[PDB]
Design a protein around this motif. Structure first.
Motif, PDB file in Angstrom:
ATOM      1  N   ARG A  22       0.855  -1.166   0.000  1.00  0.00           N
ATOM      2  CA  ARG A  22       0.000   0.000   0.000  1.00  0.00           C
ATOM      3  C   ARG A  22       0.886   1.208   0.000  1.00  0.00           C
ATOM      4  O   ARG A  22       0.510   2.279  -0.455  1.00  0.00           O
ATOM      5  CB  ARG A  22      -0.772  -0.027   1.302  1.00  0.00           C
ATOM      6  CG  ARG A  22      -0.659  -1.389   1.985  1.00  0.00           C
ATOM      7  CD  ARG A  22      -1.274  -1.414   3.354  1.00  0.00           C
ATOM      8  NE  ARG A  22      -0.318  -1.041   4.383  1.00  0.00           N
ATOM      9  CZ  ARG A  22       0.090  -1.855   5.345  1.00  0.00           C
ATOM     10  NH1 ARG A  22      -0.379  -3.087   5.416  1.00  0.00           N
ATOM     11  NH2 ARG A  22       0.961  -1.432   6.243  1.00  0.00           N
ATOM     12  N   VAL A  39       2.919   1.990  -3.466  1.00  0.00           N
ATOM     13  CA  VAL A  39       2.116   2.894  -4.296  1.00  0.00           C
ATOM     14  C   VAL A  39       2.275   4.344  -3.862  1.00  0.00           C
ATOM     15  O   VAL A  39       2.400   5.239  -4.696  1.00  0.00           O
ATOM     16  CB  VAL A  39       0.607   2.521  -4.282  1.00  0.00           C
ATOM     17  CG1 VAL A  39      -0.251   3.683  -3.780  1.00  0.00           C
ATOM     18  CG2 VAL A  39       0.154   2.065  -5.665  1.00  0.00           C
ATOM     19  N   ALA A  89       6.397   5.090  -4.666  1.00  0.00           N
ATOM     20  CA  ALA A  89       6.650   5.313  -6.078  1.00  0.00           C
ATOM     21  C   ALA A  89       5.786   6.483  -6.546  1.00  0.00           C
ATOM     22  O   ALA A  89       6.054   7.081  -7.591  1.00  0.00           O
ATOM     23  CB  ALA A  89       6.350   4.061  -6.887  1.00  0.00           C
ATOM     24  N   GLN A  90       4.758   6.813  -5.761  1.00  0.00           N
ATOM     25  CA  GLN A  90       3.899   7.963  -6.066  1.00  0.00           C
ATOM     26  C   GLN A  90       4.698   9.255  -6.018  1.00  0.00           C
ATOM     27  O   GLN A  90       4.670  10.045  -6.963  1.00  0.00           O
ATOM     28  CB  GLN A  90       2.717   8.062  -5.097  1.00  0.00           C
ATOM     29  CG  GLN A  90       2.063   9.449  -5.046  1.00  0.00           C
ATOM     30  CD  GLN A  90       0.626   9.422  -4.520  1.00  0.00           C
ATOM     31  OE1 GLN A  90       0.145  10.397  -3.929  1.00  0.00           O
ATOM     32  NE2 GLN A  90      -0.058   8.303  -4.728  1.00  0.00           N
ATOM     33  N   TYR A  98       7.884   9.313  -5.978  1.00  0.00           N
ATOM     34  CA  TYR A  98       9.137   9.077  -6.701  1.00  0.00           C
ATOM     35  C   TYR A  98       9.035   9.324  -8.209  1.00  0.00           C
ATOM     36  O   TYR A  98      10.009   9.748  -8.838  1.00  0.00           O
ATOM     37  CB  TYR A  98       9.660   7.662  -6.439  1.00  0.00           C
ATOM     38  CG  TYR A  98      11.004   7.382  -7.071  1.00  0.00           C
ATOM     39  CD1 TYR A  98      12.074   8.246  -6.881  1.00  0.00           C
ATOM     40  CD2 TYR A  98      11.208   6.246  -7.846  1.00  0.00           C
ATOM     41  CE1 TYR A  98      13.311   7.991  -7.455  1.00  0.00           C
ATOM     42  CE2 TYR A  98      12.438   5.978  -8.419  1.00  0.00           C
ATOM     43  CZ  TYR A  98      13.487   6.851  -8.223  1.00  0.00           C
ATOM     44  OH  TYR A  98      14.718   6.587  -8.793  1.00  0.00           O
ATOM     45  N   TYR A  99       7.863   9.048  -8.782  1.00  0.00           N
ATOM     46  CA  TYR A  99       7.647   9.195 -10.225  1.00  0.00           C
ATOM     47  C   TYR A  99       6.660  10.304 -10.593  1.00  0.00           C
ATOM     48  O   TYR A  99       6.307  10.449 -11.763  1.00  0.00           O
ATOM     49  CB  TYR A  99       7.159   7.886 -10.853  1.00  0.00           C
ATOM     50  CG  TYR A  99       8.095   6.702 -10.737  1.00  0.00           C
ATOM     51  CD1 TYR A  99       9.242   6.613 -11.516  1.00  0.00           C
ATOM     52  CD2 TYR A  99       7.810   5.651  -9.867  1.00  0.00           C
ATOM     53  CE1 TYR A  99      10.090   5.517 -11.418  1.00  0.00           C
ATOM     54  CE2 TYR A  99       8.648   4.554  -9.763  1.00  0.00           C
ATOM     55  CZ  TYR A  99       9.787   4.492 -10.540  1.00  0.00           C
ATOM     56  OH  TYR A  99      10.623   3.402 -10.441  1.00  0.00           O
ATOM     57  N   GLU A 100       6.200  11.075  -9.611  1.00  0.00           N
ATOM     58  CA  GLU A 100       5.228  12.135  -9.897  1.00  0.00           C
ATOM     59  C   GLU A 100       5.546  13.448  -9.190  1.00  0.00           C
ATOM     60  O   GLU A 100       5.322  14.519  -9.748  1.00  0.00           O
ATOM     61  CB  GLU A 100       3.791  11.680  -9.592  1.00  0.00           C
ATOM     62  CG  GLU A 100       3.180  10.789 -10.676  1.00  0.00           C
ATOM     63  CD  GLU A 100       1.838  10.184 -10.273  1.00  0.00           C
ATOM     64  OE1 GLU A 100       1.507   9.085 -10.769  1.00  0.00           O
ATOM     65  OE2 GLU A 100       1.116  10.803  -9.459  1.00  0.00           O
ATOM     66  N   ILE A 133       2.473  -4.163  -9.067  1.00  0.00           N
ATOM     67  CA  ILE A 133       3.031  -3.364  -7.988  1.00  0.00           C
ATOM     68  C   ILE A 133       3.650  -2.160  -8.662  1.00  0.00           C
ATOM     69  O   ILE A 133       4.725  -1.696  -8.283  1.00  0.00           O
ATOM     70  CB  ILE A 133       4.112  -4.130  -7.211  1.00  0.00           C
ATOM     71  CG1 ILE A 133       3.542  -5.435  -6.652  1.00  0.00           C
ATOM     72  CG2 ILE A 133       4.675  -3.267  -6.091  1.00  0.00           C
ATOM     73  CD1 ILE A 133       4.545  -6.253  -5.869  1.00  0.00           C
ATOM     74  N   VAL A 134       3.091  -1.727  -9.818  1.00  0.00           N
ATOM     75  CA  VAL A 134       3.581  -0.587 -10.731  1.00  0.00           C
ATOM     76  C   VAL A 134       4.665  -1.044 -11.792  1.00  0.00           C
ATOM     77  O   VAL A 134       5.841  -1.137 -11.451  1.00  0.00           O
ATOM     78  CB  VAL A 134       4.084   0.649 -10.008  1.00  0.00           C
ATOM     79  CG1 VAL A 134       5.540   0.842 -10.322  1.00  0.00           C
ATOM     80  CG2 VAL A 134       3.301   1.867 -10.477  1.00  0.00           C
TER      81      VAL A 134
END
Ligand code: CL
Lengths: 299, 308, 308, 313
Positions: free
Chosen positions: A5, A8, A11-12, A14-16, A47-48
């Motif tokens: 959980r 998400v 990486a949320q 990390y990539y946005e 898992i993305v």
């Protein structure tokens, strides 16, 4: 193990929000050594997952980018005037419908594209016409609009109707006199309903210098009126919007626009102002061009 | 790619170019020979090699000399073709006219062209030169103003020739005819017209086709000049025209026209008229009586007509 | 002159009787050596001209030869095993590309030939505004799937960005009652309805001589095919059989067959047959004599057989 | 097409594919630390490489487990939604359904396919295998008889799958419906029908979409079967269908005038399948999805978020 959980939420950022792994560690108070573990193991299954396209087409991407930015029905990005020539020709081939009236302008650009049309075995049932008068010596013969119109028609096994008046007359009384003639009437008559137009783009910035064309007195005055580019000897500003207008035999832009496809073909940073104006003005709704200048227009 | 056709083509050279015997060739190529006859045969039927026998070599030549003699032409060519289909008579003249034209040009020449079916063929058949002769091409008449198909336009012809000749060209941007004299007068004033006329004044060679009243071609006179004007022409007993300059059947000779004056056409080293017809005789003849043309390119029948 | 009559008279015998100089020299009583001087001359002075066409195209020629012999609207001969079905495939595809007009209804047959041709159609970016349909029912297992007519019809439509209408009935039913029952259905009616007005057809050619998976033996089974040999059947198209003289041959599976009749195939602007191999000569011939196809895509080798 | 993008691709692959970092990736290629970042950013921006985050990883997974629990499904996949539109919801399931399908097949399998928007998006997304798995593809229903667009045809779907799977295929040459029995019976007696039915009897996996009455999407029941027959359906209480076999909202087979006109797999045989996967979504397909679960006509269910929660009330 449902720390998923988090992967998400991690990486949320990390990539946005791209808050680095030391930025992600401190904001949610997690060991920066545990910030790195979540992303990677996930890549085993969902898992993305990130996908990278191997066969990618830069030119193609640039076309869509141009279409989006300018609301063009179409566009093609390609002495690399020859590369433009070949792909433009294809665009024009794909676009023709039986019963079409194609109009032509002058110059190295349009010639480049006509020189590359496909030789046909039966009449394509289209009709070629000039949308501008003659150069009156101002251009080499192989670039004359009638040469180009006739040449196209020959590749296309098609009707053609050459114009016997100049694009620019000495005084309005001579030009309007010519406009009264049954031959000018006939020619313009095709203008009033042309389906595809095929056009070069002039600018203030080579032998076709506005200086050498209309002569200094006049061109210095064009710079004064903030003229970005010209088409078919009809001039527009950088936002898309003339002493010789009362003395010019050529299609009115208004009529140029009623045209299903109005395909401009141009290149070079020296002509950016013109290309831009032409686009803002909606005078053309297709663009054939090279990679380099395509990037300039997207910036 | 193709079969042993290369070999066939080669033996074609031996037997036909070098007039060698089949036997000699066979020994030379170690080919069984019979094979040779077979190949020679094949090369001929499959249009790899095509032989042509000018049967009329004699009468055409005699007819050429008579035309020269009767009219004092510098030069004259008489093409003949058994296929009596008309577009074929044109190709006949075209091919030969072109040859005549190719050999007549001299470095630095100014070639002037007129319009029409005839002048066009001559151009279509021009030898494709590999190096510029330094010649220049020009219309000797304004545009058709829609009255002619594009492939017959004067610029079309000029430019097209220039291609064969690797010559620079100069296209005209004005019509051959204007509804009103004022416009015509105003146009003569332009720098452009002045430049094109500038060449007419120094014209070295001219390809020129001949019009006549009897023409039933769409290129009719009632069609080109319209009803009334055609009468005023027949009313003046006009035999024909060249660059829309008019003359009677004796050679003797407009405020709307934009084209070369006959005066200037005569100053040309070679004025070459090309025509065929019989419904053009009236006009061919007047063109000869006036020496508006030095040279004449035409077919067998027309020549027969002009000699009696 | 005068020796001009002879130059001709000699060239006549050299080139029209392909006599040998030795012979010419003999009949006429000329020293063989002047016979040669006279030829040399005849050409030097253009009484005789010899064209050798260096950029000669064998295939190209064969195409015209086929068109002439059979009155075909078009034809393509290609060159390169299956690698050579591919050569046909590419050029055929071009023929078909050139031929399409907006609003056309293309019909398809089955098999390695058609697939090959379709496999090579050009991917289009906008709808060509044509409509693809099958002109025959399904193989009922008798063919591999990539050769199924619907596969080919659908595949083509996808290259052409075009409408397509697949058929849900077999080409061959067990008994006439079923077959006509099917013909009564709105779906058959709809399909055939396109047949009744198809513009371009694209077709393979069957023959008895075949012993690949599509053997008539395998397809219809011995009993049936032996009986086809009895009725002198040269080939088939879409399961409609013809004799070597292009005569139709009602065959008895006739009343059990869902496919385009040929009255209808012929109304078709272009009916393009695509075939090759001497094993199918009979079929190709019949198909040509019958006018069932008016275009031919094929290889060099079998093209020569057809002119023999 | 290069030159730089020829480069962004190189870098992208090391950095992502190989896990190699930048200061060292830049080391490998003799370029700048600032530049590698610039390039990566560019690639992401220009779409050379696109990364995806499953925000809904948790709820979708829980919903999957509940569906399995409530209905005793062998397996179940729930693709995300309500952040998407119609045609996009399909791609969502398609992609995931496809993965589910790819991993479930076993060497020697017989795959059966039905028709329609849904079964197609599952096929469109199949992983393009590089070597044959020795599977076979077959329709489990005759043709649409014009009633469906071509790209939705049952053969189209079977053959198209076979392509991704490097499997041989077997296309059907008869319709799914025949007004008249003489014709229909004549067909069932044919060697061909016998062969295709031969496979139904041994079917190993099935991709199957679900129909309902509450349909209003071209493929309507009044449209397919026409006016009268649609009444007899609502009159008999059918909740939905699979290969034009009808059943009520409790699973029980419903018989219809049509049963003696239909050419498709029997539901007896679909159940004999190791995996029978139904793929559907839509609050209007609820009636029919549910009936399909009550009858165990499907082991597996592929569907989106909205519908998942609908079945769980
Ligand atoms: Cl395909």
């Amino acid at each position: 193990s449902d720390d998923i959980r988090l992967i998400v939420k991690i990486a949320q950022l990390y990539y946005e929000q791209d808050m680095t792994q030391a930025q992600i560690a401190r904001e949610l108070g997690i060991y920066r050594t545990t910030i790195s573990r979540l992303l990677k193991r996930g890549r085993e299954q969902g898992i993305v997952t990130i996908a990278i396209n191997y066969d990618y087409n830069e030119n193609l991407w640039l076309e869509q980018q141009l279409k989006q930015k300018f609301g063009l029905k179409e566009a093609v990005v390609a002495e690399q005037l020859s590369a433009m020539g070949q792909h433009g020709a294809l665009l024009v081939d794909r676009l023709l419908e039986p019963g079409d009236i194609i109009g032509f302008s002058w110059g190295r650009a349009v010639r480049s594209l006509v020189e590359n049309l496909p030789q046909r075995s039966q009449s394509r049932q289209v009709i070629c016409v000039p949308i501008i008068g003659g150069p009156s010596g101002k251009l080499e013969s192989r670039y004359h609009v009638n040469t180009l119109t006739y040449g196209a028609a020959a590749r296309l096994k098609a009707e053609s109707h050459l114009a016997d008046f100049p694009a620019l007359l000495d005084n309005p009384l001579i030009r309007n006199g010519i406009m009264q003639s049954q031959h000018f009437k006939t020619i313009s008559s095709y203008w009033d309903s042309l389906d595809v137009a095929l056009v070069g783009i002039g600018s203030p910035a080579d032998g076709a210098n506005w200086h050498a064309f209309y002569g200094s007195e006049e061109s210095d005055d064009l710079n004064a009126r903030h003229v970005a580019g010209d088409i078919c000897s009809r001039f527009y500003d950088i936002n898309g919007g003339t002493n010789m207008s009362e003395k010019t035999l050529s299609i009115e832009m208004a009529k140029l626009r009623q045209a299903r496809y109005s395909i401009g073909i141009a290149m070079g940073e020296e002509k950016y102002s013109g290309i831009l104006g032409a686009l803002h003005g909606r005078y053309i709704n297709c663009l054939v061009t090279n990679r380099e200048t395509a990037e300039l227009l997207l910036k």
